TrEMBL record, chain A:
Signal peptide: none annotated. This is Nuclear receptor coactivator. Belongs to the SRC/p160 nuclear receptor coactivator family. Nuclear receptor coactivator that directly binds nuclear receptors and stimulates the transcriptional activities in a hormone-dependent fashion. Involved in the coactivation of different nuclear receptors, such as for steroids (PGR, GR and ER), retinoids (RXRs), thyroid hormone (TRs) and prostanoids (PPARs). Also involved in coactivation mediated by STAT3, STAT5A, STAT5B and STAT6 transcription factors. Displays histone acetyltransferase activity toward H3 and H4; the relevance of such activity remains however unclear. It is found in: Nucleus.
């Protein structure tokens, strides 16, 4: 769950 | 009276991260060019809301102390503020950003996108009430940070940690009201008035989604 929000949050 | 160097620093970090935002040329060209149909209008709003969630995540990450919070709390704040931040940003664009003739075209599209008048009427009323305050860019940035760093959102593990981050932003905002509008002592109270009015859009939006064209991955996932 929340795979896109997590991806955007953790990038850089 | 003035902001302390510590408050000036906190304000500058918020302002720098807020001013990074820009409406993609691709989306603005669609507002100008795409056919006037309920389907094409709905898709334009979808592209706008998807762009905003990306812009919102980038802004949030840069918020002083946000990165120092528990990872699950970081996600719960993003999820709980997504709808409120969207309406606040949409109010800013309406009262500023978009040109006279170009905003008239976007308003035409919103009023012909399949959204019920039960949701269009409180939305444009909120835009007007925000417009009346003639908010500065500092006020829009701080209000967005206050919305995001809300310690009373559902599923936060360490609420006191979030309170420690939000309290200084409210202190700065109240001080900026006293400095820039010393003749209007109710200015901060009116800003709080827009914050409570923003909270009602959570129910208006959740009801709107329940009425139903599908979603984008950032949309029904951050919107539940
Ligand atoms: O542009 C806007 N308001 C400003 C404005 C207005 C009239 C003239 C000039 C300017 C504006 C208002 C709304 C929505 N938008 C785009 C936007 C702007 C800014 C940030 C995110 C989204 C989208 N939402 S939504 O619930 O997310 C949604 C997503 C997909 C399909 C249908 C939808 F309703 C609806 C309300």
């Amino acid at each position: 769950d929340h795979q896109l929000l997590r991806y955007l949050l953790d990038k850089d | 009276m003035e902001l302390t160097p510590d408050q000036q620093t906190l304000l500058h970090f918020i302002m720098d991260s807020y001013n990074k935002q820009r409406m993609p040329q691709e989306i603005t060209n669609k507002i100008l060019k795409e056919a006037f149909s309920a389907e094409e209008n709905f898709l334009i709003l979808t592209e706008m809301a998807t762009n905003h969630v990306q812009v919102l995540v980038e802004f949030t990450k840069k918020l002083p102390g946000f990165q120092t919070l528990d990872h699950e709390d970081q996600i719960a704040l993003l999820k709980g503020s997504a709808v409120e931040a969207m309406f606040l940003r949409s109010a800013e664009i309406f009262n500023k950003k978009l040109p006279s003739g170009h905003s008239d075209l976007l308003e035409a599209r919103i009023r012909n996108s399949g959204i019920s008048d039960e949701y269009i009427t409180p939305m444009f009323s909120f835009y007007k009430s925000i417009g009346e305050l003639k908010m500065t860019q500092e006020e829009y940035a701080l209000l967005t940070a206050i919305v995001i760093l809300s310690p009373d959102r559902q599923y936060i593990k360490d609420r006191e940690a979030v309170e420690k981050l939000q309290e200084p932003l409210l202190d700065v905002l109240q001080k900026l009201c006293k400095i820039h509008q010393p003749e209007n002592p109710q200015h901060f109270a009116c800003l709080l008035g827009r914050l409570t009015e923003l909270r009602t859009f959570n129910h208006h939006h959740a009801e709107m989604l329940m009425s139903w064209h599908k979603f984008t991955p950032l949309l029904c996932e951050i919107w539940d």
